[PDB]
Design a binder for this molecule. Structure first.
Ligand code: NA
Lengths: 116, 113
């Protein structure tokens, strides 16, 4: 079956992380889900906030809390090297966080990588 | 659930440690959502250092009486590991600072310098 929270990370053939699409993480009540949603949301929001503060640009974003939550973050093409490298560092940390949530709370979150 | 976070900065601005108290479950109950957010930031910080920077930070964990976590960076880090550590640590601080704004009734974040 499919978990409530779905997280797909897109990687280029050279390993560069291009985007993350997360669904199902909007705030939705009890026995287990709320705390996992909070953890996913914290990682996702801090990822974006860290890019904006430290890398110094705004990524491409699509958001909606409506049908259980939707977040798509996409890295602009042709970023200068320092922005690329900081973004990749944070993106790898975000992926690790989600991968570890999917390992330890596997009935709530699934995390996958796709190629570009 | 009064969560207190204190981050230590050296004279040049480098982050050296964070100490967090009050984030233990429970609960159950509104507060555990805030605790889970704080724990996620702390644990991902630690895991990121270990995976990407290639060393173990110094860590003290006590689950008792509201919970206690202290993470400290080794003093003599080679330059490759030092810079990467700082980006992760700044991100960790930003997350906690933003949590303290969004959940200002439950989380307080400070810096000691
Ligand atoms: Na590339």
């Amino acid at each position: 079956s499919n978990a409530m929270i779905q997280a797909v990370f897109e990687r280029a053939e050279d390993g560069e992380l291009r985007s993350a699409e997360i669904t199902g993480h909007a705030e939705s009540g009890e026995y287990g889900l709320d705390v996992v949603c909070a953890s996913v949301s914290t990682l996702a929001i801090n990822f974006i906030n860290s890019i904006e503060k430290f890398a110094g640009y705004e990524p491409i974003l699509e958001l909606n809390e409506d049908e259980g939550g939707y977040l798509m973050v996409e890295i602009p093409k042709d970023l200068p090297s320092h922005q690329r490298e900081m973004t990749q560092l944070f993106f790898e940390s975000f992926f690790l966080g989600m991968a570890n949530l999917s390992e330890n709370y596997s009935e709530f979150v699934q995390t996958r990588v796709i190629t570009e």
